[PDB]
Amino acid sequence: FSLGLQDFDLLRVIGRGSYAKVLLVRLKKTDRIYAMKVVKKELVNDDEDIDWVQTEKHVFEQASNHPFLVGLHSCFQTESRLFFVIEYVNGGDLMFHMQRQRKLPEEHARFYSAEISLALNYLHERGIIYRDLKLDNVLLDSEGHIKLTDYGMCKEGLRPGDTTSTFCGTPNYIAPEILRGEDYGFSVDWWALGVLMFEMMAGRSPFTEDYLFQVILEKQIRIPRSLSVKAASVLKSFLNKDPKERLGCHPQTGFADIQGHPFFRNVDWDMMEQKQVVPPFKPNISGEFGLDNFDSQFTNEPVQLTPDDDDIVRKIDQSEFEGFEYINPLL
Ligand SMILES: Nc1ncnc2c1ncn2[C@@H]1O[C@H](COP(=O)(O)OP(=O)(O)CP(=O)(O)O)[C@@H](O)[C@H]1O
């Protein structure tokens, strides 16, 4: 019935994180290619692990169809591993891009932040706080549009006006209200976007973790002299330390406030969401599979899954993973 590992060819290793090894794969007997995230079950032990995997799967399902999120093809498992077969996104990522470009013109940062805003707003309308926005979690597709990735840290199930309390995120991007221990909502995503926009336009972060948190909480953010009034305003508005006054966070009008901000005046949001706006940069894409923009650290790895150690695998609590199988109800 459900797909399994033996329905795919492994083509290349393309990435690694703390939970997953990511490969380019191809559905046998077809030309259809996917990314495949492989998570060893021996890494899923705590409630934090279980929730991470469950959340990633549930958000992957919500993300299918939306242009700026990564779609889910299928989930399946072997005795030792969990597998997510997902949209293959091969334009690189914004961290990669910033390492090469160093600093983006305001028009470029506008384009990326507009698409990220549309992605965030869709997640928020579905009750999801993203909580993991950072340069290397914004992928570029082959044409140069953005896709948000890495969904395990999301909070899902937030009815409008709900808040949550978990201390999490990447330190450089964690919002003041999280650092203050307040319950929070979607405001933390708009703070992170502020930080990311600062990084794009200034070429540096606006800021030990202890000292970094103190800087986030107390230090005044200075806008580079060379940025326009509109950029200064959009950055200071997103980086307001009070979530009640922050851009995008005003009740009822938040997203309209972003769309109406002078920084975004030259944005046709309807065309933007239909991918009818020309990206300002076209990623390098060559050859049969366009592996140009992945670190050779991974594309040089041998294309294989590490052999199972029976002494470990026999101890896995397989009941924890019943029902993992999934196939996209759109094929
Ligand atoms: N849909 C996709 N298409 C192409 N490459 C992808 C991809 N999803 C992930 N990758 C690559 O794999 C790398 C690791 O994936 P990811 O960061 O999601 O790992 P992870 O699930 O272990 C969570 P984390 O990295 O935050 O610890 C990414 O940095 C990216 O380069």
Numbering used by the authors: 247 to 453, 466 to 589
Paper text:
Atypical protein kinase C (aPKC) is a key apical-basal polarity determinant and Par complex component. The atypical protein kinase C (aPKC in Drosophila or PKCι/PKCζ isozymes in mammals), its binding partner Par6, and the small guanosine triphosphatase Cdc42 are three essential determinants of apical membrane identity in both Drosophila and mammals (Fletcher et al., 2012, Harris and Tepass, 2008, Hutterer et al., 2004, Izumi et al., 1998, Joberty et al., 2000, Lin et al., 2000, Wodarz et al., 2000). aPKC isoforms PKCι and PKCζ have regulatory regions distinct from those of other PKC isozymes, but share a conserved catalytic protein kinase domain. Like many protein kinases, activation of aPKC requires activation-loop phosphorylation and an αC-helix conformation compatible with Lys-Glu salt-bridge formation to bind ATP and serve to align residues within the R spine (Kornev et al., 2008).
To fully understand how Par3CR3 inhibits PKCι and disrupts its activated state, we determined the structure of an “active” conformer of PKCι for comparison. This analog was resistant to hydrolysis compared with AMPPNP. The structure has an ordered αB-αC loop and reveals side-chain contacts between Y265PKCι of the P loop and D295PKCι of the αB-αC loop. This interaction stabilizes Y265PKCι side-chain stacking with a rotamer of W298PKCι from the αC helix. Structural comparisons suggest that Par3CR3 inhibitory arm not only separates P-loop contacts with αB-αC loop/αC helix but also hijacks Y265PKCι and S264PKCι side chains to directly form hydrogen bonds with CR3 main-chain atoms.
